């Protein structure tokens, strides 16, 4: 009961209804355990708007800070993952990762051709991404460009442009660097200073169902 | 005189990429065997827009008639399933089935809440559903109300309002009533008259992949 605990979970693949369930399960565990924070190792190439928005909401309502960590090297928080990142308490990126490319689409044709959205729905997602960025005090100009210019950024760029808060090679470096940082959004109405000194790190294993469903969506 | 081959497949659940794959698989089989028609027993609460549009497109390119049959009693062709129906060569409904209810949403939220579709999306689907209805000679006025009023219809209502062509209790009655009917859209440029005198009914089983995905879904 007098411990400082950080949970670490892993989220990989397309952001779908089932990804929501994962976020909710992992965050719920950390809440009920009174965790100082939960770190989510995120690697997503794309996903659905509705699940994305539900995840952002769940993060907004989280009773503990949610740290989105684009990890491992080569991971991306592209498309829906970028919104999830921008909607969270702190963003970290591992060397060799990517953030951005958030243009909304209606989806994919038989060809594999891109089915673009009506111009006005592009403007809707622009408003939404700008909102997330300004609510978390992050660069809404660059965030807008994730859509309008299909802009994608490396860790160092994302940092320099004030889109993320941390560049870190692993969990331990993440903890060391983010220690003492204020969350970019509130936790239960208050901005919170992260206390990662003397912390116990607990890894949450993805379940059989997580790995299987991810693998199936993969193909 | 001649022996006419009719294929019958089942397509159930949310409309997704795997559903497109089912439509493509079952239609290809019927095409290669020079079928008179493929009947699809459709039961769907909704699904994804891009897959729906890909399915409508696959049906347009079909070298044989595709009959959408809302079956069994209690089934519906709601939301995305309505567009598939309207995009097909003939629509049948079993007693006690539903069609319509197509008001687009961005999706559902955590607590029963519904994320609203921006007006552009709404207008975009109004134009699309009206178009499908116009192209197939079906009631475009009523088709719009599937969206603007979330209108849902019984089979008897659907026929009376000129949205569908046939009310039938089983495959037997369907062939009997639809025999001699002209398709509502062309097959390769011409409007085919359906010949169901001397018919061999062939049922297509879902594949291993089909069954696995749906069993996961049933949990």
């Amino acid at each position: 009961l007098a411990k400082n605990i950080v949970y670490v979970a892993q989220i990989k693949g397309q952001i779908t209804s089932y990804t929501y369930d994962q976020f909710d399960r992992y965050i719920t565990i950390a809440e009920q355990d009174n965790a100082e924070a939960i770190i989510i190792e995120l690697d997503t190439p794309g996903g659905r708007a509705d699940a994305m928005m539900n995840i952002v909401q769940r993060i907004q309502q989280s009773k503990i800070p949610v740290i989105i960590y684009v990890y491992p090297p080569g991971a991306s928080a592209a498309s829906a993952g970028t919104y999830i990142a921008l909607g969270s308490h702190l963003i970290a990126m591992a060397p060799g990762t990517s953030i951005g490319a958030c243009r909304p689409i209606l989806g994919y044709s038989q060809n594999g051709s891109i089915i673009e959205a009506p111009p006005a729905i592009t403007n809707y997602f622009i408003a939404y991404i700008k909102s997330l960025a300004q609510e978390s005090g992050r660069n809404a100009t660059i965030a807008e460009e994730f859509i309008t210019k299909d802009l994608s950024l490396t860790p160092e760029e994302a940092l320099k442009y004030g889109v993320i808060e941390v560049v870190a090679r692993d969990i331990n470096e993440l903890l060391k660097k983010s220690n003492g940082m204020k969350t970019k959004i509130p936790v239960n109405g208050r901005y919170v200073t992260l206390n990662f000194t003397n912390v116990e790190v607990r890894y949450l294993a993805p379940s059989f169902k997580d790995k299987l469903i991810s693998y199936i969506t993969d193909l | 005189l001649a022996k006419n081959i009719v294929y019958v497949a089942q397509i159930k659940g949310q409309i997704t990429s795997y559903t497109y794959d089912q439509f493509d698989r079952y239609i290809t089989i019927a095409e290669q065997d020079n079928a008179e028609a493929i009947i699809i027993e459709l039961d769907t609460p909704g699904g994804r827009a891009d897959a729906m549009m890909n399915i409508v497109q696959r049906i347009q390119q079909s070298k044989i008639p595709v009959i959408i049959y809302v079956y069994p009693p209690g089934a519906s062709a709601a939301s995305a399933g309505t567009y598939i129906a309207l995009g097909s060569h003939l629509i049948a409904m079993a007693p006690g089935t539903s069609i319509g209810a197509c008001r687009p949403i961005l999706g559902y939220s955590q607590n029963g809440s519904i994320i609203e579709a921006p007006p552009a999306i709404t207008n975009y689907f109004i134009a699309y559903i009206k178009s499908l209805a116009q192209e197939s000679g079906r009631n475009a006025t009523i088709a719009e109300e599937f969206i603007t009023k979330d209108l849902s219809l019984t089979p008897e209502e659907a026929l009376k309002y000129g949205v569908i062509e046939v009310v039938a209790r089983d495959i037997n009655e369907l062939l009997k009533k639809s025999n001699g009917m002209k398709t509502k859209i062309p097959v390769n440029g011409r409007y085919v008259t359906l010949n169901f005198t001397n018919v061999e009914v062939r049922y297509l089983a879902p594949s291993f992949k089909d069954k696995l995905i749906s069993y996961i879904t049933d949990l």
Binding site: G47, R48, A49, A80, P104 | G47, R103
Partner: peptide
């Protein structure tokens, strides 16, 4: 490339 739509 966020995919936008479903329907009820």
């Amino acid at each position: 490339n966020v995919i936008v739509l479903m329907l009820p």
